[PDB]
């Protein structure tokens with residue numbers, strides 16, 4: 384399957400005998416599933432993102448079938464709003480990011496998909512994040528009257544400033560669109576600009 388990023392990349396998974404919906408998230412190191420039973424030895428972990436940290440239970444060697452592809456690995460169980468399939472299991476299903484092109488790279492997920500971007504004249508590092516609706520960057524100055532917004536992740540909500548029609552180059556591909564500026568843990572390129580540079584998920 385090639386999955387476009389016009390909407391959230393939600394797929395059916397099978398885990399612990401149960402069928403669930405989960406978001407394919409290149410911006411997640413780990414896989415985080417809603418409160419559920421996994422008999423097995425577990426250990427406590429805290430994981431973080433936008434809004435802060437949540438406490439989860441770490442189970443290992445849990446089989447997870449993702450759109451009919453078998454994977455097995457570590458699953459973190461806790462109060463997430465959205466079941467998230469992260470890179471630990473995406474790699475096992477041979478998921479890549481691809482920008483269409485006689486060019487456009489193919490990016491595997493064994494390491495975080497970090498890229499250089501140019502925004503406001505400034506080179507920054509940012510994570511290609513299919514789990515993010517929007518693009519969120521650390522405090523910087525951009526032009527415009529910005530609308531304050533709140534966005535959430537996972538650990539809660541944060542306040543951001545919204546800037547619209549901002550040029551952004553992402554590994555050399557041109558985008559112009561909405562950028563949210565605020566206290567994000569990591570600079571993230573979300574689906575609003577991934578779609579502009581032709582990015583798809585591919586198994």
Ligand SMILES: CCCC[C@H](CC(O)(O)[C@H](CCCC)NC(=O)[C@@H](NC(=O)[C@@H](NC(C)=O)[C@@H](C)O)[C@@H](C)CC)C(=O)N[C@@H](CCC(N)=O)C(=O)N[C@@H](CCCNC(=N)N)C(N)=O
Nearest residue numbers: 410411412413431432465514515516517534535536537568
């Ligand atoms: C639980 C909500 C969906 C999860 C994604 C996660 C993520 O954007 O991929 C981020 C990106 C990096 C940190 C910012 N990844 C993470 O948050 C993950 N963190 C990590 O992988 C690492 N943590 C750190 C600190 O980097 C690791 C060391 O623990 C965790 C899931 C834990 C594995 C997320 O936070 N998406 C937001 C991004 C902000 C945005 N505005 O786009 C989003 O789409 N939010 C929307 C909708 C939220 C979901 N809505 C829904 N109906 N399900 C919003 N408007 O509030």
